[PDB]
Design an enzyme around this catalytic site. Sequence first.
Site, PDB file in Angstrom:
ATOM      1  N   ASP A  79     -24.432 -37.215   6.395  1.00 63.35           N
ATOM      2  CA  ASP A  79     -23.943 -37.168   7.749  1.00 63.35           C
ATOM      3  C   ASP A  79     -24.238 -35.763   8.291  1.00 63.35           C
ATOM      4  OD1 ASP A  79     -22.665 -38.266   9.992  1.00 63.35           O
ATOM      5  OD2 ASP A  79     -20.627 -37.779   9.467  1.00 63.35           O
TER       6      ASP A  79
HETATM    7  C1  LIG Z   1     -24.599 -42.452   5.577  1.00 68.04           C
HETATM    8  C2  LIG Z   1     -24.833 -43.369   6.817  1.00 68.04           C
HETATM    9  C3  LIG Z   1     -25.871 -44.413   6.448  1.00 68.04           C
HETATM   10  C4  LIG Z   1     -23.543 -44.097   7.183  1.00 68.04           C
HETATM   11  C5  LIG Z   1     -23.142 -43.770   8.539  1.00 68.04           C
HETATM   12  S1  LIG Z   1     -22.042 -42.279   8.407  1.00 68.04           S
HETATM   13  P1  LIG Z   1     -21.989 -42.359  10.512  1.00 68.04           P
HETATM   14  O1  LIG Z   1     -22.359 -41.084  11.229  1.00 68.04           O
HETATM   15  O2  LIG Z   1     -23.055 -43.613  10.830  1.00 68.04           O
HETATM   16  O3  LIG Z   1     -20.473 -43.013  10.751  1.00 68.04           O
HETATM   17  P2  LIG Z   1     -19.238 -42.458  11.626  1.00 68.04           P
HETATM   18  O4  LIG Z   1     -19.635 -42.828  12.992  1.00 68.04           O
HETATM   19  O5  LIG Z   1     -19.183 -40.917  11.316  1.00 68.04           O
HETATM   20  O6  LIG Z   1     -17.770 -43.246  11.243  1.00 68.04           O
HETATM   21 MG   LIG Z   2     -22.804 -39.266  12.111  1.00 65.43          MG
END
Ligand SMILES: CC(C)=CCSP(=O)(O)OP(=O)(O)O
Ligand SMILES: [Mg+2]
Lengths: 230, 230
Positions: free
Chosen positions: A13
Amino acid sequence: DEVTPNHVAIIIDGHRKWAKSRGVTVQEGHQTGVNNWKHIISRASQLGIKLLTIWALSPQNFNRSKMEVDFLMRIYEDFLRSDVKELVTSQQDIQFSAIGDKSRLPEYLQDAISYAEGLSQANKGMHFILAVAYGGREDIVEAARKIAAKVEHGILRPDDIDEATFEQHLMTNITKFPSPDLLIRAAGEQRLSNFFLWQLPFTEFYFTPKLFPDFGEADLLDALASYRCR
Amino acid sequence: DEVTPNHVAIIIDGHRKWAKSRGVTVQEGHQTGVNNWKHIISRASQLGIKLLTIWALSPQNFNRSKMEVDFLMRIYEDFLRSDVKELVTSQQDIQFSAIGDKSRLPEYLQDAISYAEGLSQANKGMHFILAVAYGGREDIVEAARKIAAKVEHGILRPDDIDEATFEQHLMTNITKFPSPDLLIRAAGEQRLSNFFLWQLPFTEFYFTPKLFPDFGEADLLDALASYRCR
Ligand SMILES: CC(C)=CCSP(=O)(O)OP(=O)(O)O
Ligand SMILES: [Mg+2]
Ligand SMILES: CC(C)=CCSP(=O)(O)OP(=O)(O)O
Ligand SMILES: [Mg+2]
């Protein structure tokens, strides 16, 4: 030791935040992220971790722009063609698998996956799972569905369903270490974002503010030293 | 606001550590813990939270000494007889339910539970769930089992199984907010310890070092201010 986790999983992330702050494109944030993987994997292998899982793509991530998602898919094909090929054929003798809804990736990515899975099929070193189009709710639902089909064909009765049975129909049934000992999440958020759910009842969580493009071998070492302190 | 979580869940922990450090008995650690609950509940009600869940007992906790577990069961009966009775009949008009494997508690606790559930049955204020002999894997397994029975009786086909269907067979099917917006865990550990699993894909986690006997209304306020910052 045995104070070495068997399974370590990583939520990546912070790529866009990082791009943004470097004045650079998000595609470049992503590319620099993925370039970190091979060293992370090698390091986990050297430490005697038996399974490393990197979560590369959720089902919800298919809601980002088509261009973004396509760029990721190609970056991943490139990773599986250069970097993973090296890893599986090196002395680390890494075993590669992918988990998730593979039906949902383009054909070229599916091909990269089966090529690296074939290439590494007999290897005996650390297992490396790339979780791509993987979501924890979807995993459970799909498990429940398989088990229901088996119930429908008299192969299984309802009171035969226990944890162990449930566990064998999940996408993690390819390992004997389905449940991570240590879950690392970069970029500061403190949530699972629909990663593993079933697999996490006793997993130790480790959150770092570090943006994943900045995440290296030392950051894995740090996560492990926290783990050993718990 | 809408920056107020609908569902807040709390993992209590740190009672023995606290006793130990106060030179006092673990039973007294537990009692002082449970005495905090009523103020936490009142405060969450005042803040307009729609559901508060306090996790009081896991299935694994039945592995502690029999004396410890019996003391907890009585402390809980006492809580449900004095404190919860007040809450449900006060102007807060709290609705009480318990979730978990109730079959597994003594008869006296089961009775306290149904009495407080009957007493509060028509109330319209904040829902308060006491999760007792509740475990997340067990919840999923039990869901899967019910769904399989329904499949076996032709009531449901395997491809009818989706999230929503799955969600209606979990122990959280008594709420329209099954999934916590905010999960608080006292005493510093960073793990779920087999609490909710299905219910947590986008839950915000909040970890405080504070031992639960020291955990008050201000600590809930703090958790909420973190939540509003995410
Ligand atoms: C590691 C990736 C594939 C999963 C998504 S983490 P994100 O930035 O898509 O999710 P959030 O929006 O931080 O809850
Ligand atoms: Mg993200
Ligand atoms: C809140 C209670 C009922 C759940 C148990 S938290 P714990 O101290 O029993 O669990 P850990 O041993 O800290 O993983
Ligand atoms: Mg404890």
